[PDB]
Scaffold this active site. Structure first.
Site, PDB file in Angstrom:
ATOM      1  N   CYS A  63       3.432   1.503   9.330  1.00  0.00           N
ATOM      2  CA  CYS A  63       3.365   0.343   8.429  1.00  0.00           C
ATOM      3  C   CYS A  63       4.723  -0.020   7.919  1.00  0.00           C
ATOM      4  O   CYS A  63       5.558   0.859   7.692  1.00  0.00           O
ATOM      5  CB  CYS A  63       2.403   0.594   7.275  1.00  0.00           C
ATOM      6  SG  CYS A  63       0.869   1.384   7.785  1.00  0.00           S
TER       7      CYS A  63
ATOM      8  N   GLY B   3       2.232   5.884   9.484  1.00  0.00           N
ATOM      9  CA  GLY B   3       3.638   5.787   9.118  1.00  0.00           C
ATOM     10  C   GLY B   3       4.331   4.583   9.743  1.00  0.00           C
ATOM     11  O   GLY B   3       5.448   4.252   9.338  1.00  0.00           O
TER      12      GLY B   3
ATOM     13  N   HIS C 218       0.802  -1.198   0.000  1.00  0.00           N
ATOM     14  CA  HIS C 218       0.000   0.000   0.000  1.00  0.00           C
ATOM     15  C   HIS C 218       0.854   1.276   0.000  1.00  0.00           C
ATOM     16  O   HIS C 218       0.289   2.350  -0.158  1.00  0.00           O
ATOM     17  CB  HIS C 218      -1.086   0.014   1.077  1.00  0.00           C
ATOM     18  CG  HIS C 218      -0.577   0.292   2.447  1.00  0.00           C
ATOM     19  ND1 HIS C 218      -0.585  -0.676   3.422  1.00  0.00           N
ATOM     20  CD2 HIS C 218      -0.145   1.452   2.982  1.00  0.00           C
ATOM     21  CE1 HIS C 218      -0.128  -0.085   4.519  1.00  0.00           C
ATOM     22  NE2 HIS C 218       0.157   1.200   4.295  1.00  0.00           N
TER      23      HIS C 218
HETATM   24  O1  LIG Z   1      -4.204   1.560   8.684  1.00  0.00           O
HETATM   25  C1  LIG Z   1      -3.389   2.354   8.228  1.00  0.00           C
HETATM   26  N1  LIG Z   1      -2.317   2.777   8.945  1.00  0.00           N
HETATM   27  C2  LIG Z   1      -2.076   2.314  10.225  1.00  0.00           C
HETATM   28  N2  LIG Z   1      -1.683   1.106  10.587  1.00  0.00           N
HETATM   29  N3  LIG Z   1      -1.560   1.113  11.969  1.00  0.00           N
HETATM   30  C3  LIG Z   1      -1.894   2.303  12.379  1.00  0.00           C
HETATM   31  N4  LIG Z   1      -2.244   3.104  11.328  1.00  0.00           N
HETATM   32  C4  LIG Z   1      -2.824   4.459  11.355  1.00  0.00           C
HETATM   33  C5  LIG Z   1      -4.265   4.590  11.010  1.00  0.00           C
HETATM   34  C6  LIG Z   1      -3.811   4.783  12.420  1.00  0.00           C
HETATM   35  C7  LIG Z   1      -3.525   2.961   6.831  1.00  0.00           C
HETATM   36  C8  LIG Z   1      -4.257   4.313   6.949  1.00  0.00           C
HETATM   37  C9  LIG Z   1      -5.733   4.076   7.155  1.00  0.00           C
HETATM   38  O2  LIG Z   1      -6.321   3.315   6.070  1.00  0.00           O
HETATM   39  C10 LIG Z   1      -5.652   2.172   5.701  1.00  0.00           C
HETATM   40  C11 LIG Z   1      -6.397   1.234   4.997  1.00  0.00           C
HETATM   41  C12 LIG Z   1      -5.799   0.054   4.586  1.00  0.00           C
HETATM   42  C13 LIG Z   1      -4.468  -0.158   4.868  1.00  0.00           C
HETATM   43 CL1  LIG Z   1      -3.691  -1.596   4.271  1.00  0.00          CL
HETATM   44  C14 LIG Z   1      -3.717   0.765   5.567  1.00  0.00           C
HETATM   45  C15 LIG Z   1      -4.304   1.952   6.004  1.00  0.00           C
END
Ligand SMILES: O=C(Nc1nncn1C1CC1)[C@@H]1CCOc2ccc(Cl)cc21
Ligand SMILES: O=C(Nc1nncn1C1CC1)[C@@H]1CCOc2ccc(Cl)cc21
EC number: 3.4.19.12
Lengths: 304, 304
Positions: free
Chosen positions: B145, B143, B41
């Protein structure tokens, strides 16, 4: 989101760990620049520990008696000196992996990461707090002495603790890197009173703010309190009295959540008086005091 | 003595962390040998995430679009390929800090350390378990990820998890290092059901053994139970059913304390039916399930 008992990354500290052997005793040393720091009790036998005369025991040792090993390579000891409860072994080679570092004396209630080591080898890392009574509740077995506690600010490692002993009560005691014990402890196998301990109120409030930030808000209520009223409850429940200095340190978290510090104090007062009622806050069924307000801000803003 | 939620020392993993930027998205990558692994992603914009066509999005990218940075030095990308939900960026330089490593798919209920990173920089390390429902309860911000989970056996790092996302419920989801999600999750911003979760019974029993070893024995009782009777209670309290395979894995701890596994099961049954009654076990007011029997043995014998 999410909130965990997070340790600092230990890489910079791993590169400083060595094994120090004197006679039949082996423990850990910290190699920084051309000095290796280790607990002075490396020079005692098990029988010397009842009441060791460290000055006399050290006089029977020469540089060649201190065997210092970094992984597989042997360090050449060209000096030795005792500073409080630590030995400083001057070696002929500066540690190539020496990070930017400082030696600091932490305050009771502050937190730090411990890199538990055996025979100069890292075993694990965990975060803990220095209790108000100057003990730590660690995980340390025979040979873990010399393991260090530290904090990191960007690329600078501030070493704050070197592990020396386990009191008969199973709690842990150690020194700053100048060999001064935290608390009333002495490096001898004798029963030693650790003072009355208290809960670190400002840390519990910081963690309640971490809870709100991370979705847990069931404990928030319609009440408020004052420092005086809260401290009456803090007194009853063996919590550290809250001061305006503590309130000021919670300023950033109060500003971030919009919950005034005294309003969070009323939530804590209700939790102290009524308990959790079978509920949890951030995966805990008790009031957590091992996160400082700085730890909560750092964890919630992703500081590297 | 003492028992802590201990992470593996993260040094070997720190040396593998890089920052990967594609377009306007920046996250972490794991640099091993001449390959950098990161969540696919990284190629999406915030709007692409509703339902991204990863094969189409990746076709608009060239090697020169993937900016890979290790600290301050820039890596030259000479290949790119998508394997399940991960991208593999072939670089022209093998990571000089590549440790001995393996890629493993862990089982639900197993534990691992997570090195949380932002912009290729390590922020902290914590130990957690893969829930029976294939989620983890981490501490991950935007960030994070690309941050990885791992275990270490002497000098070999077994990477088991790469972080991909936070579900709308605040729980975390990720993949093995071949990009296969643990659980039913997909890398898209859509509401996704995480299955019914259960408590990891064999881990709670392991931790009860860790408690006895470390001085906490108040919960030991005069009773015993059978697997059948214990599993009726496990069913009621949403615990994983205990099997003879679990009993066998607790063999070493049963031999070490002299407490038969079914006798520890009777202690756990009483704790489930009656609670802790305002008491604690190893600093916890709830039944801890993030230590496997291997973790307890390793922590209690000081494995480096
Ligand atoms: O989840 C995600 N990042 C993430 N992973 N642990 C914490 N966080 C942030 C949000 C707090 C991204 C952004 C939100 O939308 C998505 C949707 C699908 C995927 Cl794969 C990634 C993401
Ligand atoms: O405490 C010590 N080692 C230690 N520190 N954390 C864990 N452990 C082992 C015992 C479990 C040594 C051995 C016991 O007798 C003493 C007496 C005084 C001093 Cl300074 C050290 C020691």
């Amino acid at each position: 989101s999410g909130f965990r008992k997070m340790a600092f990354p230990s890489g910079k500290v791993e590169g400083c760990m060595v094994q120090v052997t004197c006679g039949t005793t082996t423990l850990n040393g910290l190699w920084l620049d051309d000095v290796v720091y280790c607990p002075r009790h490396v020079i005692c036998t098990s029988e010397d520990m009842l009441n060791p005369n460290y000055e006399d025991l050290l006089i029977r040792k020469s540089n060649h008696n201190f065997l210092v090993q970094a992984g597989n390579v042997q360090l050449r000891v060209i000096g030795h000196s005792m500073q409080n409860c630590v030995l400083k072994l001057k070696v002929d080679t500066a540690n190539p992996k020496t990070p930017k570092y400082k030696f600091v004396r932490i305050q009771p209630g502050q937190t730090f990461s411990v890199l538990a080591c055996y025979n100069g080898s890292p075993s694990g890392v965990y975060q803990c707090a220095m209790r108000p009574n100057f003990t730590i509740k660690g995980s340390f077995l025979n040979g873990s002495c010399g393991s260090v506690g530290f904090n990191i600010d960007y690329d600078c490692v501030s070493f704050c603790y070197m592990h020396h002993m386990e009191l008969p009560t199973g709690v842990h005691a150690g020194t700053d890197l100048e060999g001064n014990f935290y608390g009333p402890f002495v490096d001898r196998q004798t029963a030693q009173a650790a003072g009355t301990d208290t809960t670190i109120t400002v840390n519990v409030l910081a963690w309640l703010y971490a809870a709100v930030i991370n979705g847990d808000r069931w404990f928030l209520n319609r009440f408020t309190t004052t420092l005086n009223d809260f401290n009456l409850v803090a007194m009853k429940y063996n919590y550290e009295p809250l001061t305006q200095d503590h309130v000021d340190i919670l300023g950033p978290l109060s500003a971030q959540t919009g919950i005034a510090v005294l309003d969070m104090c009323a939530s804590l007062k209700e939790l102290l008086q009524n308990g959790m009622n079978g509920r949890t806050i951030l995966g805990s069924a008790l009031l957590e005091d091992e996160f400082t307000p700085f730890d909560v801000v750092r964890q919630c803003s992703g500081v590297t």
